[model samples]
Target: SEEQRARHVRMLEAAIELATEKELARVQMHEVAKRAGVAIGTLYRYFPSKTHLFVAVMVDQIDRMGESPQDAVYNVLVRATRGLLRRPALSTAMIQSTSTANVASVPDAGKVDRAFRQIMLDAAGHPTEEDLTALRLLVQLWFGVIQSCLNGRVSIPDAESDIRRACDLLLVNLS
Candidate 1:
């Protein structure tokens, strides 16, 4: 598991570097290979296309945060993280190309969507606004984290500080 996991991280980091450096559409297997210091064939063995690469990045980032078997706390944080992860790339690339309207989830969106909605439906103990307006606001704040993360915009201590600040912002609204 460690070997496979390490390899997966290297590949995912390679893809992120490629996209962040060259932009998404311009990245190819050869470029990923060169950047990763591996053969083009090896890159292709891991990822067949840019879509797979980005999706892999999305999921890799998700796993880095956490994953839930039954979608409780993990689901909440995933909801908080995944929706917010793309603002840096999305806004940066917005005018460069047409954006694809989609949900980048490990679980087929139908399931995540239903689960998300069900959580919305039953917010008795949770913060129940009866709508997801506050949740969307929380997502926007989380995107502020990825904005800095994409650029290394802050020092490590400062970056984590900013994350705690963002969490505070979300908690203030939710509570």
Candidate 2:
């Protein structure tokens, strides 16, 4: 069981490195196995497809974020945005994979959503029912902001401003 966990970590680590170095379309599965020091079959055994691998990678990345008990929602969101922007290729790979994945085939897709919500809720202190609804909407809006920024359709400054604006409007009534 421990060995299986180790191999899974290695695969994710190797995928992150390769995804950072190249676009998703250019990343080869066998290359990932080679770099992870695992067999091609082993890599596929863990992740049946590149989409599965990247979606799992997204969950791993979110899981790595430090818990912020006292941080503002804006701070949590902004920190995540900046982290992804710093590694554009890897961000694109993970985000694109999650966005494109069918939930039926890629269950980690839900993990990504749940992980983000949990972090934001933790940052929200004591959230009311109304706060939960608003926060859910805010997360959806933030995803659009991220997608636009990743697509180069919106400037980083504009995206940051939009996030700040959304937080002010949506989180104004948090308990």
Candidate 3:
């Protein structure tokens, strides 16, 4: 039902906002329910666990992108990175959940991956087999970049430069 979908969307938003502040480890399901104005049971009905919530949140976040085509293939990477920077905690939580999602959350993870692929394809702007391969590799690099940032292994500026260089190397001929 539309109402059910609407409630789920609200819950996802609230969860992401809270995650931005505290990351997923410290967020409580009860607080998510209260913040979303949904019953505890209702929140559970939509998301069985924090893993599930963050997994869906990842898909929802990706779905919100790719509405407009980027000027350059590299610009897609830049724009997406900029968006994720707004809430590093939330982004980290989502990416971590995406990797660790259990079988029960596979479907949601699949949705996240699918949305991510489409966003990249749209950004690639005339995606070919080679472009697809590059985008796939770029996504993998993004995962590493985020994890590096979370672990203090790499600074944002370093990651950004590396990302730009990788994109240029991969897509230069096509561009």
In model 3, where is the ten-residue run with the lowest total lDDT? 66-75
Arranged by TM-score, best first: 2, 3, 1
Off by over 4 Å in 3: 66-71, 126-128, 173-175
> Which candidate model has the greater lDDT, 1 or 3?
3
Q: List the residue pairs that clash in candidate 1.
A: none
Model 1 lDDT on a 0 to 1 scale: 0.49
Model 3 agreement with the true structure over 3-63: per-residue lDDT tens digits:
8778877898899889977957899999999999999998988788889888888888888
- For 1-175, candidate 2 gives per-residue lDDT tens digits of 9998898889999999999888999999999999999989889988999999999999999876633332388888888889988898999998899889999999889888788788777776665678668878898898889889998887788899999888888767666
How far is each candidate from the true structure, as Cα RMSD in Å?
9.0, 2.4, 2.9
Tell me the spans in candidate 1 whose CA falls farther than 4 Å from its real position.
1-4, 65-87, 90-175
Query: On residues 93-152, what C-alpha lDDT tens digit does candidate 1 reach at each position?
Result: 321221231444222222333443444334313445623555454444544554555566
* Of candidates 3 and 2, the better by TM-score: 2
TM agreement with the true structure for every prediction: 0.43, 0.92, 0.86
Error of 2 at 120 (Å): 0.7
